[PDB]
Ligand binder design. Structure first.
Ligand code: R3U
Ligand code: R3U
Lengths: 228, 11, 229, 12, 13
C-alpha cells in the first residue's frame, strides 16, 4: 500500500479537505428560499463566494505551500480557482449525497439566468467525471494537484511548486493502482481530465459576460477571481 | 453571520 | 474520416517527422562498437545530440511555428526536447522488434552508468505507451502537440502557441475515434500521458546529476539543452 | 490587484 | 541561459 510518509500526507490533506463545508445560512437559502432567476443567481454567487474562501484555507494548509514565494502564491490561487470549483462541482453531482438536495441545486442552477447552451455541457462533463468512480480521497488530491500546478502563467519558481505536486501525484497514482488494478491506465485517464478542466477555464470567462440578472453584481471576491 | 463571510458577501 | 484542412495539416506534419532519421554511422556503432559502460555512454549521448538536431528540423517545418515570437520558439524547443525524446524512446522500444538493432540499444542502456532505480521505471512507462498501441501519425502528432505547448515556462504569448496546438489536438482526437471507437475516454488517456511526461522531465534532470562515466563530458549541445553543469 | 485575495492568503 | 547553440540550430538550419 502507501508508505508512512504518503499516509501522513494523505491523512493531513483529507482533514483540511473536510475541515470546512457550507455554512448553514447558505444551506438554508438552498432549501427554503425563493425560486426566481434573480435570487438563485444570488444563492449561487453566495455559494461560489464561500467556496473560494474555503479554497484559500485548504490551500494555505497544503504542506509547504507557505514556503513558496508570496507572488507565486497568488498566481496558483488565481490560476486554479475556477478549475477547483468545476472539480468540486463534478464530485457534488455524483455524491452519495442523499435525497434531492443536489436535484435541488441542479434545478436552481437551471433557473438562474444561464443559458442551457452553457449549462448542458458542464453537467454532461460532470457525468463523465463520475463514470471514473473517484473517492473523496481521490477528489481531495486531484484538487491539490490542480492548485499546485507549476505550469501556470507567472510562476517565477516552477521548480518549487513541482517539488510539492510530485508527492500528491505519487500518492494519487498509487491509490489508482490500489483502488483499480482492473485496468492499469486509470491514473493517466485521471490526469487527462485535469487537462480537460483547463479547457473550460476560458469558457467560464465567456459565460460570465452573459451571466447578469436584474442588473445585479457579483460579489467583490468573485470579481477578483473570475476577473469581472 | 460568519464575520468574514458577510462583507465578502456584501456586494 | 478527417477533413480536407485536417489532411493538408496531417500530410505536412508526417513528412517532416519522416524527413530525417538517424545517420547510418551512429546507428552502426550500436551494433559494432566495444560493449562497455563508457562506450555505450558515448554512443547514447551521440544519438541524443542528433535527436535534438532532428527535433529542431522537425519543428521549424511544423505549420505556423515561425510566425511565433522568435523567443517563444526557443522557449518551446528547450522546454520540450527532453519530453520529445521520451515520446520517441517509447516508439522505438514499441515497434515490431526490428531485431537488427533496438534490442541492443536497450542492452547498451542498462550498461551505461545510469541507475537501475531510474531505468526500470522508464521502460515501465514506455510499455504503458504501448498499451495505447499508437501509430506513427499518432506518435508524430503527440510529439508535435508536446513541442507546441503554451504551458511552457517563459512563454510570452501563449494564445499564439495555444492557437497552433488545438488543430493538432483535434486531429489526434479524430484519429482516436477511428482507431478505438470502443473507448471514448481514450483520447483522454493520451492527454494524461502528456502530464505524465512532464513528471519524468524532473526525474531526467536529477538523474543527470549522477550520470557520469570516468570523467567523460556530455556534448556541448546536450549541456545547453539538458542544463547539466 | 488581488488585495482581497492576498488578504485571505495572508490573514491568520 | 543564452541558449546559444539551440539558437544557432533554430536560425540557420
Ligand atoms: C452550469 C453549472 C454551474 C455549477 O457548476 C455551479 C456550482 C457548482 C457547485 C458550486 C459551489 C460553490 C460549491 C461549493 C462547495 O462545495 N462549498 S464547500 O464549502 O462545501 C467546499 C468548498 C471547497 C472544497 O474544496 C476544498 F476543500 F477547498 F479543497 C470543499 C468544500 C457552484 C454553486 C458554483 C457556481 C457554478 C455555476 C453556476 C457558475 C458558472 C460555471 O462555472 C458553472 F458551471 C455553473
Ligand atoms: C533509460 C532509458 C534511456 C533511453 O530513453 C535513451 C534513448 C531512447 C532513444 C533515444 C534516441 C536519441 C532516439 C533516436 C531516434 O529516434 N532518432 S531518429 O533520428 O530516428 C528520430 C528523431 C526524432 C524524430 O522525431 C522528430 F521528427 F524529430 F520529431 C524522429 C526520428 C535515446 C538514445 C536517448 C538517450 C536515452 C537515455 C540513455 C538518456 C536520457 C534518459 O532520459 C533516458 F531515460 C535514457
Amino acid at each position: 500500500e502507501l508508505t508512512p510518509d504518503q499516509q501522513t500526507l494523505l491523512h493531513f490533506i483529507m482533514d483540511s479537505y473536510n475541515k470546512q463545508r457550507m455554512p448553514q445560512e447558505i444551506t438554508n437559502k438552498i432549501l427554503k428560499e425563493a425560486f426566481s432567476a434573480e435570487e438563485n443567481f444570488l444563492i449561487l454567487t453566495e455559494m461560489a463566494t464561500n467556496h473560494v474562501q474555503v479554497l484559500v484555507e485548504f490551500t494555505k494548509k497544503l504542506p509547504g505551500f507557505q514556503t513558496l514565494d508570496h507572488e507565486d502564491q497568488i498566481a496558483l490561487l488565481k490560476g486554479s480557482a475556477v478549475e477547483a470549483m468545476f472539480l468540486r462541482s463534478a464530485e457534488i453531482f455524483n455524491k452519495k449525497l442523499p435525497s434531492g438536495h443536489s436535484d435541488l441545486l441542479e434545478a436552481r442552477i437551471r433557473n438562474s439566468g444561464i443559458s442551457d447552451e452553457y449549462i448542458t455541457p458542464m453537467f454532461s462533463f460532470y457525468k463523465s467525471i463520475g463514470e471514473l468512480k473517484m473517492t473523496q480521497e481521490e477528489y481531495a488530491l486531484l484538487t491539490a494537484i490542480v492548485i499546485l500546478s507549476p505550469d501556470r502563467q507567472y510562476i517565477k519558481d516552477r521548480e518549487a511548486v513541482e517539488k510539492l505536486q510530485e508527492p500528491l501525484l505519487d500518492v494519487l497514482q498509487k491509490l489508482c493502482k490500489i483502488h483499480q488494478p482492473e485496468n492499469p491506465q486509470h491514473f493517466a485517464c485521471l490526469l487527462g481530465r485535469l487537462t480537460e478542466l483547463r479547457t473550460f477555464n476560458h469558457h467560464h470567462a465567456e459565460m460570465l459576460m452573459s451571466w447578469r440578472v436584474n442588473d445585479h453584481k457579483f460579489t467583490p471576491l468573485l470579481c477578483e477571481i473570475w476577473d469581472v | 453571520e460568519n464575520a468574514l463571510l458577510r462583507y465578502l458577501l456584501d456586494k
